[PDB]
Amino acid sequence: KVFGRCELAAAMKRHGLDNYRGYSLGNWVCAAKFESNFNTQATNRNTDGSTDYGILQINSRWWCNDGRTPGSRNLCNIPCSALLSSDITASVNCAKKIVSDGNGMNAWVAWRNRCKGTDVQAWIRGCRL
Ligand SMILES: [Cl-]
Ligand SMILES: [Cl-]
Ligand SMILES: [Cl-]
Ligand SMILES: [Cl-]
Ligand code: NA
Ligand code: NA
C-alpha cells in the first residue's frame, strides 16, 4: 500500500507513536517519507547482505527473520515479510522496540540526515488528527 501523508499520520497516531519516547508524530512521518516514500512494500538491500523492509525500512540484521541474513538476530520476533503488510501494526510495534534501544531515532540514518533539526511538524500540517 502507498499511504497518503495524513492517512499515515492518523494510523501512526492511533498505534501510539505520537510523542512515543518524546518523538512527535512529524518525526515518524518524515522518516517514513524518506525511508520508503510511504510504500509498505519497499525493500532495499544493504552492503552487508541484510535487507530493509517496509514503511520504516527495518533491517534483517537485528530485527526480523528473512531466512537469508547469516549471523543475524530477530529481536522483534517476526518474519520480515510481515513488515510489508498494508496493516502497519507490526512495523509500528517493532519500531517502538528499536527507538527504545538507546539511540532513539538516530537508528534511522535517513531521520538523522533529513529530518533531525528540521521543522518536522510541517509533515502533519493540515491533517485532521
Ligand atoms: Cl508527501
Ligand atoms: Cl519532537
Ligand atoms: Cl494499520
Ligand atoms: Cl531519545
Ligand atoms: Na510533529
Ligand atoms: Na534476522
Curated annotation (Swiss-Prot):
Gene3D superfamilies, per the entry: 1.10.530.10
Listed Pfam families: Lys (PF00062)
Keyword Signal recorded: yes
Domain C-type lysozyme: 1-129
Catalytic activity: Hydrolysis of (1->4)-beta-linkages between N-acetylmuramic acid and N-acetyl-D-glucosamine residues in a peptidoglycan and between N-acetyl-D-glucosamine residues in chitodextrins
SMART domains: LYZ1 (SM00263)
Enzyme class: hydrolase
The protein's Enzyme Commission number: 3.2.1.17
GO cellular component terms given for this protein: cytoplasm; endoplasmic reticulum; extracellular space
SUPFAM superfamilies xrefs: Lysozyme-like (SSF53955)
GO biological process, one term: cell wall macromolecule catabolic process
Location relative to the cell: Secreted
Active site: 35, 52
Quaternary organization: Monomer.
Job description of the protein: Lysozymes have primarily a bacteriolytic function; those in tissues and body fluids are associated with the monocyte-macrophage system and enhance the activity of immunoagents. Has bacteriolytic activity against M.luteus.
The family this protein is said to belong to: Belongs to the glycosyl hydrolase 22 family.
Designated name of the protein: Lysozyme C
The organism of origin for this protein: Gallus gallus
